[PDB]
């Protein structure tokens, strides 16, 4: 192309949408929806009973119905704790099973970008060589235009002066290409970093969501 290649970053979100992960991620997503189907039926059942009993018992709200409704607001929160623990258990399990394979996909996707850039760099060299080959042709054709075997000394001297211009151009473009390569590779190193830490943060967040809920669901009711 005309502009340099811009590569999309390799994130956890991008990997889920990759083609290789599909055979695994679908099965994992399938497990969640069935278990969430199991969960969804149970809250529906518990909601029917709770909503059918609360219709029995006015705007006094000082009666011995206070221990009854917080009996509901106790048992339902206990059930929900069971639900979310089952969910977090499965999610962590999905992470363990897929963990090594995802590292592998990122390495492979990043390798693809390296090859893409490498090919792009190859075309740039071919382009420079074409420009330089036309340069050599232009110097020979111009020597046939002017006059002054007696005039061949200037063409050979022009050749001695072009190889120097050519050798330098090759030197400097490689430097630019190598920096592009180094910058791209560093991007990949950071991606691997942020991938690993984001997963760590996820698990930790589950730990803290789980822990906070024990003293929090008591302050919550379902409507």
């Amino acid at each position: 192309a005309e502009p340099p290649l811009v590569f999309e970053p390799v994130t956890l979100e991008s990997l889920r949408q990759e083609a290789g992960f599909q055979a695994v991620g679908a099965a994992q997503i399938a497990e969640l929806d069935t278990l969430r189907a199991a969960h969804a039926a149970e809250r529906t059942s518990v909601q029917k009973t709770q909503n059918a009993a609360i219709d029995k018992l006015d705007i006094r709200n000082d009666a011995n119905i206070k221990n009854s409704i917080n009996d509901q607001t106790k048992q339902w929160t206990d059930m929900i704790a069971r639900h979310r623990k089952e969910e977090w258990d499965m999610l962590r399990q999905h992470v363990q099973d897929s963990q090594d394979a995802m590292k592998a996909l990122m390495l492979t996707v990043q390798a693809a970008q390296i090859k893409q850039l490498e090919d792009r760099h190859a075309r740039d060299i071919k382009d420079l060589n074409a420009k330089q080959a036309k340069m050599s042709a232009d110097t020979a054709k111009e020597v046939q235009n002017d006059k002054t075997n007696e005039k061949d000394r200037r063409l050979r001297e022009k050749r001695q002066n072009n190889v120097k211009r050519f050798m330098e151009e090759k030197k400097q473009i490689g430097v630019k290409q190598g920096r592009a390569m180094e910058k791209l590779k560093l991007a990949h190193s950071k991606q691997i970093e942020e991938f690993s830490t984001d997963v760590q943060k996820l698990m930790d967040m589950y730990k803290i969501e789980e822990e906070a809920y024990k003293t929090q669901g008591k302050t919550e009711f379902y409507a």
Partner: protein, 193 residues
């Protein structure tokens, strides 16, 4: 370290956490309704934020352990994860409370069927902040309400600093038309990516 946190001024506090849950409901994120900053909408009593006894509702958390809290470049899950992460010592925050606290007040309405509502409410002194919203039922809340959106009225009844049993009962009544007054924080933006 610890300061006074006067309103309409950025105060840097040092709040001791020590691996303990902070227990707050925050709103923020690029995929969120609150795109102008991170604002506390509920504080839980058993959490460390209530244990600090310095953060009321509608306080804009601009920074969090040396991390500027910009909601424009972070998803809602990333902003929520900031408050649900393990911290070993006192966390350094830059908090911006206001008087008057910057907020937009809108309204919501619908009709009920029986299908439960799908909202888990936690009564606050301001109202009832939504702790968990179930997608897939009653689509209106799906496009208007969110975890962090506080409900200040129900069937014309205000929920300002009400007991737990009363709010549970009146929400359980359902059986017809419904109407809720909501408050969402629309704070002045105060950070950059």
């Amino acid at each position: 370290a610890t300061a006074e946190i006067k309103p309409n001024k950025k105060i840097l506090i040092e709040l001791k956490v020590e691996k303990k849950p902070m227990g707050v409901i925050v709103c923020g994120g690029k995929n969120n309704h609150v795109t102008t900053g991170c604002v506390i909408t509920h504080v839980y009593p058993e959490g460390q934020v209530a244990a600090d006894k310095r953060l009321k509702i509608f306080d804009h958390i601009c920074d969090i352990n040396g991390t500027p809290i910009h909601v424009g470049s972070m998803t809602t899950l990333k902003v929520h994860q900031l408050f649900h992460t393990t911290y070993e010592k006192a966390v350094t925050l830059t908090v911006f409370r206001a008087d008057p606290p910057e907020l937009e007040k809108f309204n919501v309405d619908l009709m009920k069927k029986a299908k439960e509502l799908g909202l888990s409410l936690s009564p606050n002194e301001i109202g009832c902040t939504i702790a968990d919203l179930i997608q897939g039922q009653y689509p209106e809340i799906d496009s208007k309400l969110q975890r962090g959106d506080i409900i200040t009225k129900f069937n014309g009844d205000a929920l300002e600093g009400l007991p737990f049993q009363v709010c549970y009962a009146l929400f359980k009544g359902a059986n017809g038309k419904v109407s809720m007054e909501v408050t969402r924080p629309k704070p002045t933006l105060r950070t950059e990516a």
